[PDB]
């Protein structure tokens, strides 16, 4: 099928050019499902911690987004305790020139640079919005109790 080549494609790719601090491939021999890890970006209050995800490539695949879940606890306006990412390229902006490594840069961005005007979690958002020293503070923390 053509989400299987593109899929295969991605992966030597990924393998070629290797994202800045991320991974990401099949454990295993499913292809339409795979493992990321992104380490916490440098001067994100999320550095030193390790992030954990699952990717679920759908059969249309690149015509339809991947299914991202963030599966390591994290502190943050846009993600929630269901791992959900509220990413715009990872619904209505998706487009098939969009790759996994696209998708995982986006996600270290967001890390650096939360969207606190479309918050999945109101208090985080509002903390951000309000008193980004204490975010930072707690955010934090919980890289510290949770992501490593």
């Known amino acids: 099928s053509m989400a299987l080549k593109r899929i295969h494609k991605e992966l030597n790719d990924l393998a070629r050019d290797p994202p800045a601090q991320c991974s990401a491939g099949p454990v295993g021999d499913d292809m339409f499902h795979w493992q990321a890890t992104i380490m916490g970006?440098?001067?994100?209050?999320?550095?030193?911690?390790?992030?954990?995800?699952?990717?679920?490539?759908?059969?249309?695949?690149?015509?339809?987004?991947?299914?991202?879940?963030?599966?390591?606890?994290i502190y943050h306006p846009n993600i929630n305790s269901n791992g959900s990412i509220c990413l715009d390229i990872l619904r209505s902006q998706w487009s098939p020139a969009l790759t996994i490594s696209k998708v995982l840069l986006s996600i270290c961005s967001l890390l650096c640079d939360p969207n606190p005007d479309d918050p999945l979690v109101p208090?985080?958002?509002?903390?951000?919005?309000?008193?980004?020293?204490?975010?930072?503070?707690?955010?934090?923390?919980?890289?510290?109790?949770?992501?490593?």
């Open 41 to 73: 970006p440098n001067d994100s209050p999320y550095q030193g911690g390790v992030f954990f995800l699952t990717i679920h490539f759908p059969t249309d695949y690149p015509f339809k987004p991947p299914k991202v879940a963030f599966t390591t606890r």
């Open 123 to 148: 208090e985080i958002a509002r903390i951000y919005k309000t008193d980004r020293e204490k975010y930072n503070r707690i955010a934090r923390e919980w890289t510290q109790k949770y992501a490593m």
